[PDB]
């Protein structure tokens, strides 16, 4: 499933704000003829990966590490995506895209009243290139400058980021008082491969809800998706979702901050192999929060270069100069391991000021 | 090809369970077949037990000595709350904690969910027959010669016909068994035995594929092991006034 | 235009077993241990393996599913060693206790280590022939599978009785999330070509000398190496290719 | 029934000259130096040589007559290396005086010395490409042949003028009364693959920087080795073929 | 036809030597066939080893115990000067003392002259594999199950490929081996072994038909045994400065 549509040579500006990621998928190195498709009903539950408030005019990272992921719409220990990583050793992507092999989609949704109005920039970078993720988080670069970025305007008078399910019962709710159940069942049984409207979500459009969604790529060198958690700190595989709310004014023409959103995810694009029994080392889902980000050893000079080619990171009192003094301090620390964390570049101490942080770093 | 051995049994083509839902030799990364429904009027879905039904899992070891009395011996298999079938990764409790209802197949005339394999290695200096009863009630009997292999599908304890203290009306009327009350149990005894002065013990193991179990209502995965209090089965199956 | 591929030939196969075992079946029609009770297999019925380092064909259980093995060829240097200097090498092990576990690690010949030592990265498939000689009062019941992540993880494999089928044979293909690991390092968490032997039961006499020995042959089959290692441009000379003048009195 | 011959392939030919010389003729119809006066040849007209370690074909003078080279195969071990890891390797020499003599001894690559080092006896053919860059006032007249027994013995060869044909190429086959000499020893009195360069005249200007340099490429072509050398039956292991478990915290 | 035995092996049709020059069951007064030449360009004659090649001769006895180390064990067979193969009457040294040159056959890819049979009787309470290597070098391997029969043709020590102190130029170039330097040797070791508390020793014998050996230059019979001085092999294979 989850096809590979061929675009045109030139992208039409009325649909896309960036060029296309590629004109063909990138299915080398992935061993697609290897597993066995395993469609159980547990795969059809989505996962509430992120829920909460998100600051306006700042890129927010959502580390989308599906092996150790937590579900905020469920109180249990495992969920629909992480139990798939408990049961099997090998997960094999079905198809691919312009970034890498792709294993799922995400969905951003936000129920807003009509008195606020803004827009959302979103992109999901594979994690083979985490520099482009981290440079966007630190305010050094914007999301509009990398291919694959979409813009969706949640306001509104606008029916964009919204979820409408219409329950999967065999009755279809044919005796409903004062209105029609739109797109539920006993309208159309639209296939997962096809992409159509039912017939009733063509004149409704409150229940049609043009979604804010992308895909979940992994990385373009692995053959399958065997998770070890020591190897993926050295060569990361799982992607990172980048979200940026831009304008968001109120009816008093006052710029808002910290809007509420929530992100759903599913992984319905994989094949399985090597079913495992009574194992000891498990992928250890962290309770109640998240994963963080891993910056490996060979990514340091790429993060270092992007601060240096930024005129705003040198002047004091700005947000980029805070991260850059926190970045130079962590490089002068003592690391027994071969990677640092984004949280280490947020909860660190401070010195004075920029140049002496670099002279002490070329000696260490 | 030339060694003195005492191995050989029924050659499982002659056994009567399914041989496609419980495959004799599945291919290395393939998935097993979906089992048959009890009746055409129940709800149906895609199976979530396909990869799990290709794996005989180590459950328990029983010792096969010279019997003294004539009594049976009950082996209780509760796949819902048992810290041997819930380890990490792909364990057997995973279909029983994603679902609300569960059932089996009615190919023999009664519902019969989980299957157990008893394979017996023996030296040539011991011989005998193990007798395995399908449930607590006077159900079907499987005879296991020493040095042979057999598979025994098991009745759930709910559907054995006996009137117990719990005994809900949906137990005799519905084939759907709310998943936490789905324990199965078999009885065994040694029915024939002869030996020499060389061996006396003859330990065997019980393998536990979850063949022809079905499920109905797909929830989101519940927590694996209840590490709080183990008194919960007494507040579940006794029900004081 | 591509630089030409050159071939070298090896001629008559050192350490080849030319008188095989009689307890190991040659065809699938002469093997019915899965049917009655002797082999309880969770990976299927055994398929026929033809290998040059063993004289007669034999049926082997597929511990992993057979695949094609993508070989990336973008860097400088590539070689197909491919059953050259290949042998079934035997080692003896004692059967473990009921709780413990035995991991057999693969081995390979000296001449395979030399030629593969000209490169940096490799992958290969593996074959195993396990033989347990069972004298009289043997009631051993064994279990063989392939290890995956750690010490306790169990996968689908075979269980068998050595008193009625003394020889078993196995087929272990290359399964890894990276093709072409480094030879001396490997990926952390890889399977490689290891197998796992475990004792289920011991229903033997008192007269049988227990902890009964196990013999395991291992052959490292089709090898494809990648990455040309020695950047030596200097020239070498031996006396055999020179002009040796007759010594003058 | 014979033990099977195994083949290994080498893939894309290290140290291959892919941009050759323009003064070396590709066909016999574009070569007439024997006719007028430039090459005085006593061994015939040059025949076309196709070799993989040089991109374009070239005409070479046969310093010895071409033959078949019997290879005795009665002892254990035989190999056809056969242009594998083969290269034209250059060296510089100064032209000798009129009385003296220059013997060029053949050379071969490091990777040829490794694989041929698995055997005891060998034979091979040889090729030479001699280039004398002649600036303006060059009147050199040279002489090339193959040595036979001692320091003074002269055989039939070629004489040429480098001012009008700067590049000459040669073909030296294996001629010996014993096939398969020992590699490090050789027969006493053998020819091997040596050639001999001798200066006849020096009719150059006073401005030419004399003792003018000579460049000689040498390639050691078709190698057949005999006699399996290392009687090592022990088994070897490298970390790339092992099962490396994930380290537990 | 009904006794408990543990005998049976490869049924020598599947072995690869000649089966006509080394016959499996020759008729009672007939003569064996002449072996094949190494190459069509060597000299040929009538065979003088035809009646001798129909007789397995008692050579040596080796003991087959539980091995401790992994080392090989060399068994040297020198058919020219050995007081076991030169008794009286029809002995095996007689073709090696009427001739100047000798050779074997090249059906496998190398010259391989004398053949040895290792037949193993066993009780059912012991099992294992004997591993026989064709020479000192890394030559072909013959596996001998206990309770089975195999025939192993042997490389001469001269043509094993190793460079020794003697190492004449005709050794690698000619297939003809001046008759006094024609010793063969095989190596053996126990590669698998299991037993019970009944037997531990398992003695076997080595039979030594002179199959597919050839000869060239027919002299008049030299004396049988050299009963003067046994230091002659040190003045023959060491050659001080």
Q: H or E element: which one contains B172?
A: helix B170-173
Q: Mention every residue, 6+ apart, whose C-beta is less than 8 A from residue D181.
A: C240, D121, D122, D123, D187, D190
Contact at CB, D3 and E140, closer than 8 angstroms? yes
Q: Which residues of E touch D228 (CB under 8 A)?
A: 137-138, 161
* CB of A282 less than 8 A from some CB of C: no
Omega before residue A156 within 30° of 0, cis? yes
Our CA angle for A186, A191, A195, nearest 5°, is 110
A164 vs A156: CA distance, rounded Å:
17
CB contact under 8 A, C108 and D82: no
To what resolution in angstroms was this structure determined? Answer: 2.7
Between CA A153 and CA A247 the distance in angstroms is 10
């065809």: which residue's tokens? Answer: C27
Look at residues C27, C21, C22, C86 and name the one whose alpha carbon lies nearest to residue C53. Answer: C86
Q: Which of A44, A50, A11, A84 is nearest to A282 (CA)?
A: A84
Q: For E180, which DSSP code?
A: T
Pick left, alpha or beta for residue D226 (phi over 0 → left; psi -120 to 50 → alpha; otherwise beta): beta
Would you call C201 and B24 a contact, using CB atoms and an 8 Å cutoff?
Answer: no
Interchain CB contact of A31 with C (< 8 Å):
yes
Please state, in angstroms and rounded to a whole number, the distance separating the CA atoms of residues B177 and B159.
Answer: 9
D247 interfacial to chain A (CB closer than 8 Å): yes
Give the residue from chain A lying closest to B49, CA to CA: A40
The span from the CA of A106 to the CA of A269, in Å, is: 12
Q: Specify which residues A243 forms β-bridges with.
A: A60, A122
d(CA E36, CA E16): 14
- Closest CB from D75, D121, D178 relative to E110: D75
Query: Is the CB of E136 less than 8 angstroms away from the CB of D120?
Result: no
Provide, as residue numbers in chain D, all residues whose Cβ is less than 8 Å from the Cβ of C188.
244-247
Q: Mind telling me how many Å the CA of D7 is from chain A's nearest CA?
A: 28
* Helix or strand (DSSP H, E) at A308: helix A300-308
Shortest CA gap D183–chain C (Å): 3
Nearest CA in chain C to B32: C42
Q: How far apart are CA B111 and CA B103, in angstroms?
A: 8
Chains in touch with D (3+ beta-carbon pairs under 8 Å) read: A, C, E
- Say which residues have a Cβ less than 8 Å from residue A92's Cβ, sequence separation at least 6: A30, A31, A32, A34, A35, A224, A225, A270, A271, A272, A273
d(CA E212, CA E218): 17
Largest separation between any pair of C-alpha atoms in chain D: 85
Instruction: Write B229-236 long-range contacts (CB < 8 A, 24+).
Output: B232/B81, B233/B81, B236/B180, B236/B181
A53 strand-pairing partners: A260
**Interface residue B54 vs chain A (CB under 8 A):** yes
Question: Quick one: which of B154, B56, B38, B49 has its CA closest to B93?
Answer: B49
Strand bridging mode A101-109 / A212-217: antiparallel
Q: What sign does the CA torsion over A196, A202, A205, A206 have?
A: negative
Closest CA to C151 of B86, B55, A280, A226: A280
Q: Which residues of E touch B3 (CB under 8 A)?
A: 6, 127
- Rounded CA-CA distance A198/A166 in Å is 12
**Closest chain B residue to the Cα of A71, Cα to Cα:** B220
Alpha carbon dihedral A341, A345, A347, A348, in 10-degree steps, equals: 120
- Residues whose CB is less than 8 angstroms from the CB of residue B181 and which lie 6 or more positions away in sequence, other chains included: B158, B166, B236
**Chain D interface mutation, best of A281, A283, A284, A337, highest count of D Cβ atoms under 10 Å:** A281
Token pair for residue D219? 């390639």
Chain D contact set for E106 (CB, 8 A) = 73-74
Closest CA relative to residue C165, chosen from B1, E8, E6, B124: B1
Q: Cα distance from A166 to chain D (closest Cα, Å)?
A: 46
Partners of residue C145 in chain A, C-beta under 8 Å: none
- The CA–CA distances, whole Å, from C164 to A308, C39, E7 equal 74, 9, 16
Q: How far is D71 from chain C (nearest CA, A)?
A: 14
Query: Largest Cα–Cα distance of chain C, in whole Å?
Result: 85
Q: Do E4 and B2 touch (CB under 8 A)?
A: no
- Gyration radius (Cα) of chain A, Å: 22
d(CA B28, CA B44): 27
φ and ψ at E14, to 5 degrees?
-75, -10
Q: Count other Cβ atoms within 10 Å, centred on residue C49.
A: 17
Q: Which residue on chain C is closest to E126 by alpha carbon?
A: C135
For E125, name the nearest residue in chain B, comparing CA atoms only: B4
The DSSP 8-state label assigned to residue E47 in this structure reads: -
- Separation between Cα atoms, residue E61 and residue E58, nearest integer Å: 9
Question: What element of type H or E holds B191?
Answer: strand B184-195
Question: Phi first, then psi: what are they for A160, rounded to 5°?
Answer: -100, -70
Which residues of chain C does A90 touch, with a Cβ-Cβ cutoff of 8 Å? 175, 177
B201 contacts in C (CB within 8 Å)?
203
**C90–chain E Cβ distance below 8 A for any pair:** yes
Cβ atoms of A236 and A292 within 8 Å: the answer is: no
Chains C, D: CB contacts under 8 A, how many?
247
Q: Do chains A and D touch (3 or more CB pairs under 8 A)?
A: yes
Can you tell me the distance from the alpha carbon of E192 to that of E194, in angstroms, rounded to the nearest whole number? Answer: 7
Residue in C closest to A276 by C-alpha: C155
3-state helix, strand, coil in chain B (%, to 5): 5, 25, 70
Q: How far apart are CA D126 and CA D223, in angstroms?
A: 10
Strand bridging mode D108-109 / D181-182? unpaired
Q: Is A50 helix (H, G, I), strand (E, B) or coil?
A: strand
Residue of C nearest to B150 (CA): C37
Q: Which long-range contacts (CB under 8 A, 24 or more apart) does E37-41 make?
A: E37/E105, E37/E214, E38/D74, E38/E103, E38/E104, E38/E105, E38/E106, E38/E111, E38/E175, E39/E106, E39/E175
CB contact under 8 Å between A90 and C177, yes or no, is: yes
Chain A contact set for D248 (CB, 8 A): 280-281
What's the CA gap between B101 and B215, in Å, rounded?
6
* Residues of chain E contacting D4 with CB distance shorter than 8 Å: none
CB contact under 8 A, C135 and E194: yes
Per the structure block, which two tokens stand in for E134?
């064709």
Closest by CA position to E12, among listed E150, E162, E112? E150
Element (H, E) at B58: strand B58-63
Distance from CA of A331 to the nearest CA of B (A): 38
Do chain B and chain D touch with ≥3 beta carbon pairs under 8 Å? no
Minimum-distance CB partner of D244 among C14, C16, C187: C187
Nearest partner of C65 among A84, A220, A96, A275, judged by Cα: A275
> How does DSSP assign D109-161, residue by residue?
EHHHHHHGGGEEEEE--EEEEEE----SS--EEEEEE---SSSS---S-EEE-
Q: What is the three-class DSSP state of C112?
A: helix
Q: Given an 8 Å threshold on Cβ–Cβ distance, is D79 in contact with C246?
A: no
Residues of A in contact with C67 (CB under 8 A): 31, 33-34
**CB of A274 less than 8 A from some CB of B:** yes
E107/D1 touch (CB, cutoff 8 Å), yes or no: yes
Residue C47 in contact with residue B25, Cβ under 8 Å? no
Cis peptide before E63 (omega within 30 of 0): no
CA–CA gap between residue A255 and residue A57 (Å, rounded) = 10
What is the DSSP code string of B108-159? SSS-B--EEEEE----TTEEEEEEEESSSSS--EEEEETT-EEEEE--BSTT
Contact yes or no, A with E (3+ CB pairs under 8 Å)? no
Which residues on chain E are in Cβ contact (under 8 Å) with D231? Answer: 136-138, 162
Q: How far apart, in whole angstroms, are the C-alpha atoms of residue B134 and residue B141? A: 6
CB C136 within 8 A of CB E6: no
Chain A and chain C share a number of CB contacts under 8 A equal to 64
Burial of C72 (0-12, 13-18, 19+ CB in 10 A): middle
Contacts of E88 by beta carbon, 8 Å cutoff, 6+ apart: none
Strands C58-62 and C167-172, bridge-based pairing: parallel
D2 → chain E, closest CA residue: E108
The experimental method, as deposited, was cryo-EM
Adjacent-strand bridge partners of A95: A102
The distance from CA B206 to its chain's CA centroid, rounded to whole angstroms, is 9
Residues from chain A contacting residue C70 (CB–CB below 8 Å)? 29, 31, 223
Distance CA A222, CA C176 (A): 9
């Amino acid at each position: 499933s989850l096809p590979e549509n061929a675009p045109n040579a030139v992208s039409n500006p009325q649909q896309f704000i960036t060029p296309a990621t590629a004109l063909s998928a990138e299915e080398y190195n992935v061993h697609e003829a290897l597993g066995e498709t395993e469609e159980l009903e547990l795969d059809e539950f989505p996962v509430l990966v992120f829920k909460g408030n998100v600051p306006v005019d700042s890129v927010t990272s959502i580390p989308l590490d599906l092996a150790t992921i937590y579900d905020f719409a469920w109180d249990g220990e495992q969920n629909a995506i992480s139990q798939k990583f408990q049961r099997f050793a090998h997960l094999i992507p079905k198809s691919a895209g312009g970034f890498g092999p792709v294993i799922g989609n995400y969905t951003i949704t936000a129920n807003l009243p009509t008195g606020v109005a803004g827009r959302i920039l979103h992109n999901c970078l594979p994690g083979d290139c985490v520099d482009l993720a981290v440079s966007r988080i630190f305010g050094l670069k914007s999301l509009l400058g990398v291919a694959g970025t979409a813009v969706s305007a949640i306001g509104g008078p606008l029916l964009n980021g919204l979820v409408n399910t219409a329950a999967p019962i065999l009755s279809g709710a044919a005796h409903a008082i004062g209105g029609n159940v739109v797109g539920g069942l006993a309208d159309a049984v639209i296939d997962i491969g096809s992409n159509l409207l039912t017939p009733k979500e063509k004149e409704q459009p409150s229940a049609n809800s043009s979604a804010i969604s992308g895909d979940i790529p992994i990385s373009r060198f692995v053959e399958m998706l065997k998770y070890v958690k020591e190897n993926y700190q050295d060569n990361p595989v799982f992607p990172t979702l980048l979200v940026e709310p831009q304008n968001f004014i109120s009816n008093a023409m006052t710029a808002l901050k910290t809007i509420p959103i929530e992100v759903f995810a599913n992984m319905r694009n994989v094949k399985v192999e090597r079913n495992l029994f009574d194992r000891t080392v498990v992928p250890t889902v962290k309770e109640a929060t998240l994963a963080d980000i891993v910056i490996p050893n060979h990514m340091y000079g790429y993060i270092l270069r992007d601060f240096l080619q930024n005129k705003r990171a040198f002047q004091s009192g700005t947000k980029q100069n805070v991260y850059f003094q926190q970045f130079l301090t962590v490089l002068s620390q003592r690391n027994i391991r071969t990677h640092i964390t984004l949280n280490d570049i947020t909860s660190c101490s401070i010195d004075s000021e920029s140049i002496a942080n670099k002279i002490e770093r070329v000696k260490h | 090809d030339n060694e003195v051995t005492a191995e050989g049994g029924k050659l499982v083509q002659e056994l009567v369970y399914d041989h496609s839902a419980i495959p004799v030799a599945p291919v290395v990364e393939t998935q097993a077949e979906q089992p048959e429904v009890p009746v055409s009027l129940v709800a149906t879905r895609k199976n979530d037990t396909g990869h799990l039904a290709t794996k005989w899992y180590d459950f328990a070891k029983i010792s096969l000595s010279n019997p003294a009395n004539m009594n049976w011996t009950t082996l209780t298999i509760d796949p819902y709350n048992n810290v041997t079938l819930s380890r990490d990764g792909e364990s057997m409790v995973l279909p029983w904690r994603r679902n609300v209802w569960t059932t089996g197949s009615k190919s023999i005339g009664y519902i019969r969910t989980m299957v157990a394999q008893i394979n017996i290695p023996r030296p040539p200096q011991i011989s005998g027959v193990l007798e395995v009863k399908d449930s607590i009630n006077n159900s079907s009997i499987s005879l296991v010669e020493f040095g042979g292999k057999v598979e025994i599908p098991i009745i759930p304890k709910v559907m054995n016909g006996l009137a117990t203290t719990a005994s809900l009306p949906r137990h005799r009327l519905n084939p759907w068994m709310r998943t936490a009350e789905s324990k199965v149990e078999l009885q065994y005894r040694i029915i024939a035995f002869n030996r020499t002065s060389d061996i006396a013990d003859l330990n065997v193991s019980v393998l536990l594929r979850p063949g022809d179990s079905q499920f109905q209502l797909p929830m989101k995965p519940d927590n694996n092991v209840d590490t709080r209090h183990f008194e919960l089965v007494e507040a579940l199956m006794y029900h004081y006034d | 235009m591509q630089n030409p591929t050159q071939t070298m030939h090896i001629y008559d196969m050192p350490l080849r077993v030319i008188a095989g075992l009689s307890t190991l079946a040659k065809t699938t029609e002469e093997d019915d241990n899965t049917s009655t009770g002797i082999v309880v297999s969770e990976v299927g019925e055994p398929q026929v393996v033809n290998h040059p380092a063993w004289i007669d064909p034999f049926v082997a259980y597929q511990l992993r599913a057979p695949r094609k093995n993508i070989t990336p060829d973008f860097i400088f240097g590539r070689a197909d060693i491919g059953n050259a200097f290949s042998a079934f090498l035997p080692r003896r092990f004692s059967a473990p206790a009921v709780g413990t576990r035995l991991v057999v690690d693969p081995v390979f010949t000296y001449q395979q280590r030399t030629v593969l030592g000209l490169y940096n990265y490799f992958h290969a498939d593996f074959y195993y022939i396990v033989h347990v000689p069972a004298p009289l009062g043997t009631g051993i019941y064994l279990k063989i599978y392939a290890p995956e992540f750690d010490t306790t993880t169990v996968t689908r494999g075979i269980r068998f009785k050595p008193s009625a089928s003394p020889t078993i044979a196995l087929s272990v293909p290359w399964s890894n999330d990276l093709s072409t690991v480094e030879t001396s390092v490997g990926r952390v968490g890889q399977s490689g070509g290891s197998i796992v032997i475990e004792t289920i039961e011991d229903n033997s006499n008192e007269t049988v000398n227990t902890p009964l020995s196990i013999t395991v042959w291992c052959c490292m089959a089709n090898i494809k190496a990648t990455g040309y290692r020695h950047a030596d441009t200097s020239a070498y000379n031996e006396k055999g290719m020179n002009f040796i003048p007759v010594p003058v009195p």
